[PDB]
Amino acid sequence: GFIGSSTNLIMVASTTATLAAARFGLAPTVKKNTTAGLKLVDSKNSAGVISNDPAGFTIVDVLAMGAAGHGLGVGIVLGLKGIGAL
Amino acid sequence: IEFYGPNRAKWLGPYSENATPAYLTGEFPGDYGWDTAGLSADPETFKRYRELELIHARWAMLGALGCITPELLAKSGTQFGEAVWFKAGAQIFSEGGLDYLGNPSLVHAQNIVATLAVQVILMGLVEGYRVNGGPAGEGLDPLYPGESFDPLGLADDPDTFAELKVKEIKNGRLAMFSMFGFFVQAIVTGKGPIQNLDDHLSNPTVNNAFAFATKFTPS
Amino acid sequence: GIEFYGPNRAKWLGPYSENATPAYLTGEFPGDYGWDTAGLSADPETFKRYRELELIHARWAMLGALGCITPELLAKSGTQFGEAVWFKAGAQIFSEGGLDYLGNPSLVHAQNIVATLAVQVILMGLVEGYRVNGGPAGEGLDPLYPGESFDPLGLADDPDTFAELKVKEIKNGRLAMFSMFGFFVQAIVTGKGPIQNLDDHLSNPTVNNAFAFATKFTPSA
Amino acid sequence: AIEWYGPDRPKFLGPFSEGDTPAYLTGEFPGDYGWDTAGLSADPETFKRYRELELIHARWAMLGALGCITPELLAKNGIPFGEAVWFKAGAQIFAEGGLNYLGNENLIHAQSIIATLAFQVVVMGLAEAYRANGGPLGEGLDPLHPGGAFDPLGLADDPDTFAELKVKEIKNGRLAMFSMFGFFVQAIVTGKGPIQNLDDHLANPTAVNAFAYATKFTPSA
Amino acid sequence: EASNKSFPRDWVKTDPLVPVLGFAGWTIPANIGVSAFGGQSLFGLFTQSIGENLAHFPTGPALDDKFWLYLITYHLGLFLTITLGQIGVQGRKQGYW
Ligand code: CHL
Ligand code: CHL
Ligand code: CHL
Ligand code: CLA
Ligand SMILES: CC1=C[C@H](O)CC(C)(C)[C@H]1/C=C/C(C)=C/C=C/C(C)=C/C=C/C=C(C)/C=C/C=C(C)/C=C/C1=C(C)C[C@H](O)CC1(C)C
Ligand SMILES: CC1=C[C@H](O)CC(C)(C)[C@H]1/C=C/C(C)=C/C=C/C(C)=C/C=C/C=C(C)/C=C/C=C(C)/C=C/C1=C(C)C[C@H](O)CC1(C)C
Ligand SMILES: CC1=C[C@H](O)CC(C)(C)[C@H]1/C=C/C(C)=C/C=C/C(C)=C/C=C/C=C(C)/C=C/C=C(C)/C=C/C1=C(C)C[C@H](O)CC1(C)C
Ligand SMILES: CC1=C(/C=C/C(C)=C/C=C/C(C)=C/C=C/C=C(C)/C=C/C=C(C)/C=C/C2=C(C)CCCC2(C)C)C(C)(C)CCC1
């Protein structure tokens, strides 16, 4: 089956990886941008958007990190397919 | 017996008092009064030779136990690629990798170059920390740091710490002597330490060292 | 930038070396990275004799590395020598037809190694007794950097860059000493020239490194 | 030139030895020629232990340089005892009848190397430890020249010729160490006896010298 | 520019670590075998091209040599690496971030 294959594992791993990287202060999020030197500094947030998450994780945060992790997983699976590893 | 001060363990027995140099008073571990060749008269050179001797002793203890351990374990049931220590390095280029305990899923290393590179990086960091200082201790004794080595708290009570120091350096000098013996028993025989021990304990009359006393003769 | 004298300078362990340097290596001499971990030069006169030994070793190793590289490069470029490889270049005196210098028979054409060695002993004893004492090329001079007959190009003037040239001389000399030790051990374990070993390592670097010759001097036989 | 002491003395570079001879080599010891170019003996304690080590090396080398020449010197007369070279002389222990001293069978004729080895270990440890510390013939004296029962013939008196014979002893001893190193490497490279090398050199010097064996240790690989 | 009244002589802030680290950061990755090269590397094929073109030393390389490709790509990446290395070194040393 697909659910449980290498592609699905890699994709969920990449998506949850970016999500847990943004949630636990290891990746740039809505509330924390970066400078030229990649140091996490806060943001204006340009609207203000609420969230019940203790850290402040938002629906925008999950959309952004889902898109990034989906790009990462797509690229990884099609690369491993490209070098014959998959 | 006290291993410090004026009357201590001396290398020529109960009659060596002429053979003691003036600079070997005995305020350091393992002082037997043996500098009859006189290379360690300068106190700073005495410091450098002491740290040289202690780290040679510790590395030769590790090397003696590593010379004897896989050869003894070769007869205890497990079989490696090579069991003797002087061919224990050449098991990289054998087909099928360097298995650690013989098991093919333990290490299985085929590349000696990246192995030496990773060793060079980690060993350069360890020895730079050992001489200068680093994250497991910044400024301490150059030979006996504490607080991260001996974490079990046996370095306290400085009289038994002094006894532990002289015991460490005596076991280390014995292991240095045996490492030199391992080197020459490698070059004149080609068989390992416990292999030569079985060769001696089989018949000691002819299979002593003088069985190989004519090997390096010239032509 | 990075300097090579004074209390802070370029050291042997690099950044992890501020505790590592000994007390007697204060850094007034060229090539003072603070590497005396065995304490051989703690006495200052032993240190002075070792500096003279290091610098004369350095200059002779620079000449030797250039002379080990030069006929092999000229052979791989154009020139048929007698034996361009350096550890077999001695026995060309026994090539039954002379030692041609640049491969041409019009050159020095040496056939007697005893006379060659004998005039070398005479000239070398003269020049080294001049080096330690004095002679026609300077009597009262520095025993390591004489000058005014070994600086006809005047590069020891402006002494702030003469200190830099002293450090450059000792650094190329230590690199040449390391390279001469590499030449010796490579000659012993490979049997080919250093440029032949370089062409071998450039062809297939994965097996023309040193570890293919690791089983050569085995203790079994 | 008739002195081996003082500030002006015979030196190792001859007239080239004024810029040499540093301050701690003053000529106060037998055999001072100003040769400390390496600078190994700046500390007088280090210098004292090096002098003791050099002189016991001198005594053992004068013993050795004659004990290696006398088996071939009695093989010159035609006395056959197993083998006459010194570097293959130990294997006569493992012969069919054992090592004989002069070849006549009623002599020493011992067979077991281990028993005479144990005897050598015990009596030489006792004798050398009496040499370092003291025993039944003098307890605390010179570690260099004890005398007493070591001079039964009375050459230790009149201290100027004692110093002269000290210089004679260290000169013959240094010549013996040089000869013994030459013996070692003539055994290594040529593989024949040194007196046999002398016969081969006197038979044909121009082609049979060290340069004949110059291509032996060439690493082929 | 109230400052800069003499055109300082150290207009380029030279750290000798920069060229070394750029050569290292481009060339060591330039010696990684990729199957597009047939298991060989860019820099390895470059040294091979220079070896073949050094054989006929006086005459220059041809137009269909494939030496020029390796040269130009290797130097593109190399100059970019060295340039960005100097930039980064003097941006970390100076401000700019
Ligand atoms: C009172 C008698 C007594 C004597 C004479 C010695 C003397 C010695 N102790 Mg000892 N001790 C003695 C009692 C005691 N010791 C010690 C504690 C120690 C220690 C901790 C150490 C010694 C060591 C030594 C050795 C140092 C000398 C040396 O380096 O060998 C030089 C002389 C030789 C090597 C001659 C032997 C060679 C052999 C006879 C000839 C064979 C030649 C071969 C064919 C080789 C030739 C090669 C060819 C091919 C070119 C020596 C065996 C040291 C040691 O072990 O060094 C090795 C050492 O570390 N002793 C204690 C405890 C307090 C003693 C108590 O009584
Ligand atoms: C002192 C420096 C010096 C060095 C490093 C060499 C090097 C060599 N010569 Mg050479 N020579 C040197 C001086 C002289 N040679 C000669 C004339 C010859 C002849 C005729 C021949 C040689 C040969 C050899 C080679 C011996 C083969 C061998 O055993 O390889 C194994 C060993 C090595 C590769 C390294 C050896 C170096 C050593 C272990 C470490 C360095 C220590 C120093 C040599 C000692 C210091 C010397 C002091 C006294 C100044 C060896 C590479 C032979 C040869 O090449 O034929 C095939 C040969 O036939 N030489 C003359 C008279 C003109 C010299 C006078 O200065
Ligand atoms: C200490 C001085 C001493 C020296 C220089 C030698 C030398 C030698 N013995 Mg030996 N022995 C010595 C003491 C003793 N031996 C023996 C008993 C035997 C036996 C039974 C045999 C030998 C043999 C040999 C020769 C080995 C052949 C070889 O490998 O050539 C290569 C070596 C050389 C050509 C000499 C090179 C010199 C060396 C590298 C430098 C010298 C410094 C030494 C390393 C220091 C000496 C050791 C110290 C610690 C005592 C070798 C020349 C064998 C033999 O002759 O048959 C071939 C042999 O069968 N020896 C006893 C017990 C009584 C000794 C005790 O004093
Ligand atoms: C191992 C033996 C030995 C030892 C310990 C000494 C020790 C000493 N000598 Mg003596 N000497 C020796 C052998 C030795 N010498 C020999 C064989 C010769 C004849 C060539 C001389 C000739 C000589 C003269 C003319 C003078 C001295 C002097 C000195 C003193 C200061 C020099 C110094 O630091 O040497 C330290 C030496 C060593 C630590 C020995 C190291 C041995 C190495 C391994 C030799 C390496 C060289 C090479 C590989 C082998 C020889 C090559 C070639 C020459 C054949 C010192 C007491 C001077 C002095 O003060 O008078 C008392 C002096 O004027 N010596
Ligand atoms: C004291 C004195 C005094 C007087 O005065 C003078 C004199 C005499 C000089 C002096 C003496 C000295 C001496 C004796 C020295 C010696 C030393 C040594 C032996 C060392 C070793 C040392 C040794 C050592 C370190 C060792 C080490 C080892 C090691 C790491 C390891 C190894 C190994 C192993 C196992 C594993 C594999 O399988 C292989 C190998 C890799 C192989
Ligand atoms: C620092 C320190 C510190 C601590 O404390 C301690 C220690 C560790 C001990 C120290 C270290 C040291 C070291 C490193 C040493 C090394 C050295 C060397 C390598 C040298 C060489 C050196 C080297 C050299 C001179 C060389 C030279 C050479 C030559 C001339 C050559 C010649 C030649 C040629 C051309 C070629 C031909 O065909 C032949 C011949 C003849 C062959
Ligand atoms: C002065 C100086 C100065 C500067 O500054 C620095 C320097 C350069 C370092 C220095 C130099 C030094 C030197 C030259 C050294 C050398 C030494 C030697 C050679 C010794 C031997 C030494 C040697 C010796 C004792 C030897 C001995 C011998 C012997 C016992 C032998 C025995 C024998 C015999 C009879 C015979 C039989 O069948 C066997 C045998 C058993 C074989
Ligand atoms: C409730 C909660 C939770 C959980 C949650 C979750 C589980 C979430 C998830 C989330 C997620 C899981 C998300 C995802 C997302 C995704 C996305 C957002 C996607 C996107 C996509 C895209 C954007 C695409 C793109 C593209 C394409 C189309 C093609 C190719 C190219 C590219 C790749 C670009 C917790 C922890 C339990 C607890 C508390 C709270």
Topology of this structure?
The structure is cut from a larger assembly and holds 1 copy of chain A (86 residues), 2 copies of chain B, 1 copy of chain D (221 residues) and 1 copy of chain E (97 residues).
Chain A: H1 6-23, E1 32-34, E2 40-42, H2 59-82
Antiparallel strand pairs in A: 1-2
Helix pairs in contact in A: 1-2
Chain D: H1 44-67, H2 69-77, H3 113-132, H4 159-189, H5 194-203
Chain E: H1 17-27, H2 42-55, H3 67-92
The site of one copy of the ligand CC1=C[C@H](O)CC(C)(C)[C@H]1/C=C/C(C)=C/C=C/C(C)=C/C=C/C=C(C)/C=C/C=C(C)/C=C/C1=C(C)C[C@H](O)CC1(C)C has 18 residues of chain C, from helix 1 and helix 3.
PDB class: photosynthesis
Keywords: Supercomplex, state transition, green alga, Chlamydomonas reinhardtii, photosynthesis
Entry title: State transition supercomplex PSI-LHCI-LHCII from the LhcbM1 lacking mutant of Chlamydomonas reinhardtii
* Content of β-strand of chain E: under 5%
Largest binding interface between chains:
C-D, 32 and 27 residues
Rg from alpha-carbon coordinates of chain E: 19 Å
**Overall form of chain A:** elongated
Structural class call of chain A reads: mainly alpha
Distance separating the two termini of chain E: 22 Å
Small molecules in complex: chlorophyll B, chlorophyll A, ligand LUT, beta-carotene
Structure summary, number of beta strands of chain A: 2
Describe what this molecule looks like in 3D.
This is part of a larger assembly, with one copy of chain A (86 residues), two copies of chain B, one copy of chain D (221 residues) and one copy of chain E (97 residues). By secondary structure, chain A is mainly alpha-helical. Chain A has helices at 6-23, 59-82, and strands spanning 32-34, 40-42. In chain A, strands 1-2 form a two-stranded antiparallel ribbon. The longest helix of chain A has 24 residues, at 59-82. Chain B is an all-alpha fold and 219 residues long. Helices cover 43% and strands 0% of the residues of chain B. Chain B is built from four helices and no strands. In chain B, helix 1 (43-74) packs across helix 3 (158-189). By secondary structure, chain D is mostly helical. Chains in contact: A-E, B-C, B-D, C-D, C-E. The interface between C and D is medium-sized, with 32 and 27 residues. Residues 15, 62-63, 66-67, 70-71, 74 of chain A line the site of beta-carotene (BCR). It is classed as photosynthesis. The entry lists the keywords state transition, green alga, Chlamydomonas reinhardtii, photosynthesis.
Give me a quick take on this structure.
The PDB classes it as photosynthesis. Keywords: Supercomplex, state transition, green alga, Chlamydomonas reinhardtii, photosynthesis. Chain D has 221 residues and is an all-alpha fold.
Task: Pick out its properties.
part of a larger assembly; 5 chains; B: 219 residues; mainly alpha; 0% strand; globular; E: mainly alpha; binds chlorophyll B; binds chlorophyll A; binds the ligand CC1=C[C@H](O)CC(C)(C)[C@H]1/C=C/C(C)=C/C=C/C(C)=C/C=C/C=C(C)/C=C/C=C(C)/C=C/C1=C(C)C[C@H](O)CC1(C)C; transmembrane helix (chain B)
